[PDB]
Design a protein around this ligand. Structure first.
Ligand SMILES: [Mg+2]
Ligand SMILES: [Mg+2]
Lengths: 216, 216
């Protein structure tokens, strides 16, 4: 049901195709619209996309505006097709983009059966530092339920696809989904095809999932 | 340098060899003892071992006592050769084991250049719940530094090996190590050979690490 995409490889794809980072991120933008179609058509109801980690916001200003603009451009183009929301380390993101993203959330089809949600500035340590400071001395006790209701990723994630040929989480691990299944693809994200997508879903659906228990 | 092992596949191993889960977990212990030896030869100084997740303690009580006894037994036999420590969701673990493991921590070699550290009850949600509640109202603010000194895994993790065929974290993601490299082996943990460990180490040492940044 619930899929999280970690779209990676834009810088390398740009260099390999002799185009600008901006063109790489536009290719990403277009590929994200394709991908979502595939997802909807495969029974995904909620698609999280990790727009950025915390450390990604430490890249040069131009590289940062480039990913922000391209991710935002997807929402300007497709917002009436889905329910849109965003979350994360929003202190790391510029005011302009939060405004625009806020509006697009406003402008999106609150009634859709498909959700597309961005995490921005993703990072367990940032997430936990922020939650602690928001609730320190204001609640008697943290619980699982309070933590879930404050986590960046507000629901459980079943499947994670990460492109870009790197077998690591890169700060994108979902706090409350310990048993999320991971599919790593060596493909640079803008090269991703439907065959790639179907081979990922075929691997992910064949997994025997045990959630820390023994099959009885 | 800093390695975390997720030893998985003992119930499948036992089924394969038609033995009891006890015998499977005993073969695990023996294999842990070998693996530590390999790790030391290859320059590992701190070896973390995920003895259990939170949900693992939800297995039937006989299954729980088998993993707990087997992990404890490694330490009984080998505690004089390394510095031993343990952390995690210790409220989940039976008192008898906690007392014994603390006594073995005391008998272990405080001067060793090699640290073997068990995480018990590992789970990011349990972890963050426990940090919040221990510190709620007792510090002015949470910082990254303060979180790292309270996390289940008290240092940065470079590499993670996970055996058992499953390409997932299974509640074992290290809170403060977002860029830890992941190597997944299909081998059931008790069949692990030196050649498997060497290919894991070769793969992990060849990784091109970016920590969320771009190269200058
Ligand atoms: Mg990248
Ligand atoms: Mg298992």
């Amino acid at each position: 049901t619930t899929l999280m995409l970690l779209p990676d490889g834009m810088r390398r794809w740009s260099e390999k195709n002799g185009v600008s980072l901006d063109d790489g991120y536009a290719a990403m933008g277009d590929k994200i619209i394709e991908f979502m179609g595939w997802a909807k058509e495969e029974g995904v109801k909620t698609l999280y996309i990790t727009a950025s980690s915390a450390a990604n916001h430490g890249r040069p200003e131009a590289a940062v505006n480039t990913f922000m603009e391209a991710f935002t451009e997807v929402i300007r183009r497709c917002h009436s097709q889905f329910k849109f929301d965003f979350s994360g380390s929003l202190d790391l993101v510029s005011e302009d983009y939060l405004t625009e993203l806020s509006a697009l959330r406003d402008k999106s089809d609150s009634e859709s059966d498909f959700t597309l949600h961005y995490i921005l500035g993703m990072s367990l340590s940032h997430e936990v530092v922020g939650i602690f400071n928001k609730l320190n001395g204001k609640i008697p006790e943290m619980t699982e339920e309070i933590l879930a209701e404050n986590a960046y990723v507000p629901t459980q994630v079943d499947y994670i696809i990460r492109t870009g040929g790197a077998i690591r989480m890169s700060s994108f691990f979902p706090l409350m989904s310990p048993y999320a299944e991971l599919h790593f693809s060596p493909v640079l994200f803008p090269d991703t095809t439907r065959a790639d997508f179907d081979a990922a879903l075929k691997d992910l659906r064949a997994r025997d999932r045990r959630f820390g228990g023994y099959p009885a």
